[PDB]
Amino acid sequence: WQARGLGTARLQLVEFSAFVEPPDAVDSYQRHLFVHISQPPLESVDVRQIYDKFPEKKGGLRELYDRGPPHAFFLVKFWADLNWSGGFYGVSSQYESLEHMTLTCSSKVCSFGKQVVEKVETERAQLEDGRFVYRLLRSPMCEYLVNFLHKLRQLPERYMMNSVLENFTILQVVTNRDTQELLLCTAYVFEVSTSERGAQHHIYRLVR
Numbered sequence: 656w657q658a659r660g661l662g663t664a665r666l667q668l669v670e671f672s673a674f675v676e677p678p679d680a681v682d683s684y685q686r687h688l689f690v691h692i693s694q695p696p697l698e699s700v701d702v703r704q705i706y707d708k709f710p711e712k713k714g715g716l717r718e719l720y721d722r723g724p725p726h727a728f729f730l731v732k733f734w735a736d737l738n739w740s741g742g743f744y745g746v747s748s749q750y751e752s753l754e755h756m757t758l759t760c761s762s763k764v765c766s767f768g769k770q771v772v773e774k775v776e777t778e779r780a781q782l783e784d785g786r787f788v789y790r791l792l793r794s795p796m797c798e799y800l801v802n803f804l805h806k807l808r809q810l811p812e813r814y815m816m817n818s819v820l821e822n823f824t825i826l827q828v829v830t831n832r833d834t835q836e837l838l839l840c841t842a843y844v845f846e847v848s849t850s851e852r853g854a855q856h857h858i859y860r861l862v863r
């Protein structure tokens with residue numbers, strides 16, 4: 656009953672990506688992916704080892720995990736691709752379930768475990784092939800994240816990028832907007848991929 660992908664039997668992640676499209680994309684269209692998830696049990700990581708990397712009650716990782724359900728908590732390590740300047744920075748997420756729900760998606764950007772930006776969005780299900788799909792596509796990236804990317808892309812050494820990213824995390828909480836129950840909580844930690852390798856990720860289950 657341990658998960659093979661990022662999701663539960665009640666809500667699954669289908670695709671997730673953070674990207675930038677250059678201004679010259681109107682002609683020859685192209686996108687650059689900083690991170691990308693597209694969907695043998697997943698490895699496990701203890702959750703209290705990453706409490707210091709996210710806020711505390713309320714809104715903190717130890718509290719949502721205390722309230723459960725445990726199987727809905729995942730950790731994603733990203734190796735971001737940061738070699739790609741007034742384009743469009745956006746995030747696209749798509750989920751799937753067999754119940755018809757209205758989703759609330761909270762994204763907490765954190766620096767040194769302290770919330771710096773939060774975005775809360777709502778998306779109601781749309782039925783397709785017997786499955787309910789949720790599309791939060793091309794959500795505009797906060798200016799803070801765009802500036803952090805620009806500041807972070809000009810650092811002279813990649814080890815400095817990783818030193819800065821050591822204290823940069825994101826916490827996504829997806830809840831049933833109606834019933835107020837948590838469906839999927841994802842913790843994101845970041846490193847920079849080497850310029851030649853593209854984005855990469857490794858998904859873990861958060862256990863205790």
Ligand SMILES: *CC(=O)c1ccccc1Nc1cccc(C(F)(F)F)c1
Nearest residue numbers: 673746762774794795796797800825
């Ligand atoms: C700035 C922000 O919170 C936001 C705005 C629009 C969509 C998503 C998000 N948050 C977010 C969540 C997960 C990953 C990322 C990433 F861009 F990969 F850093 C941003």
